[PDB]
Amino acid sequence: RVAILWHEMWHEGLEEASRLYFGERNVKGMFEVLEPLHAMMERGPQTLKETSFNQAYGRDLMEAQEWCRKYMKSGNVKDLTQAWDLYYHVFRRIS
Amino acid sequence: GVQVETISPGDGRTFPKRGQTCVVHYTGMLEDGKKFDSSRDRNKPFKFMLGKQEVIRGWEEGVAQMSVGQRAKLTISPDYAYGATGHPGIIPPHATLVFDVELLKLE
Numbered sequence: 001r002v003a004i005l006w007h008e009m010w011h012e013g014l015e016e017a018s019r020l021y022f023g024e025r026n027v028k029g030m031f032e033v034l035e036p037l038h039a040m041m042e043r044g045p046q047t048l049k050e051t052s053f054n055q056a057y058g059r060d061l062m063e064a065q066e067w068c069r070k071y072m073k074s075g076n077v078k079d080l081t082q083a084w085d086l087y088y089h090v091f092r093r094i095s
Numbered sequence: 096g097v098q099v100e101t102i103s104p105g106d107g108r109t110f111p112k113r114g115q116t117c118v119v120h121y122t123g124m125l126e127d128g129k130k131f132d133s134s135r136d137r138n139k140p141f142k143f144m145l146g147k148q149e150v151i152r153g154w155e156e157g158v159a160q161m162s163v164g165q166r167a168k169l170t171i172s173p174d175y176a177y178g179a180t181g182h183p184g185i186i187p188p189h190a191t192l193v194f195d196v197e198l199l200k201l202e
């Protein structure tokens with residue numbers, strides 16, 4: 001474990017994940033570099049900074065996860081895009 | 096290459112300088128007119144910074160030709176788009192794409 005803001009953590013996580021899916025057609029990799037980030041969220045805001053970020057972007061990032069879950073069950077690939085619509089929105093706001 | 100054909104003209108002097116944010120509304124379709132994606136269906140303009148290899152090449156060179164206000168149809172050959180590999184489930188291999196894009200504003 002290491003000290004990093006959830007802000008910085010999600011920024012470069014989303015960027016790396018997107019490059020793997022969009023750029024390299026690696027849907028295995030993007031799940032790898034995304035599941036950890038989602039894991040933290042599900043465990044808890046500890047600090048006040050992680051609290052407010054969770055109030056701001058927690059819902060979207062959660063819904064984005066359900067879309068990915070939906071992809072896992074259907075293989076549709078338009079669920080993945082509905083997921084990445086939401087990732088793009090939170091990413092765009094955290095810059 | 097990428098082919099730009101005016102649907103509706105802009106001022107013709109306000110071009111997107113490398114490194115600006117283009118706010119645009121687009122509908123993308125495969126050659127035959129099969130719509131695959133439009134920001135106008137979501138009712139939500141798309142934004143991207145020009146030059147950062149953020150979008151496909153036909154967009155990079157296409158939108159760089161546009162001035163604020165202008166609406167255009169971009170015919171992008173697979174080389175300047177998703178190539179032989181496509182993007183599986185949405186854009187097939189080798190697909191010639193057509194984009195209808197309007198440049199709302201620069202920021």
Ligand SMILES: CO[C@H]1C[C@@H]2CC[C@@H](C)[C@@](O)(O2)C(=O)C(=O)N2CCCC[C@H]2C(=O)O[C@H]([C@H](C)C[C@@H]2CC[C@@H](O)[C@H](OC)C2)CC(=O)[C@H](C)/C=C(\C)[C@@H](O)[C@@H](OC)C(=O)[C@H](C)C[C@H](C)/C=C/C=C/C=C/1C
Nearest residue numbers: 014015018019022023081084085088091132148149150151
């Ligand atoms: C759910 O909707 C998707 C887009 C859909 C998916 C499938 C395609 C048919 C399509 O329907 O777009 C589509 O119509 C299309 O073909 N587009 C989108 C509109 C512009 C033109 C073209 C395009 O270039 O797409 C792009 C195409 C899919 C991939 C790129 C092609 C050029 C190449 O240089 C890049 O290399 C990696 C990858 C997708 C994008 O426009 C988004 C904005 C940008 C990226 C993903 C990358 O640039 C990434 O770089 C790491 C970034 O820097 C971003 C900002 C980082 C954040 C976290 C990621 C955000 C995710 C955004 C995803 C979005 C809106």
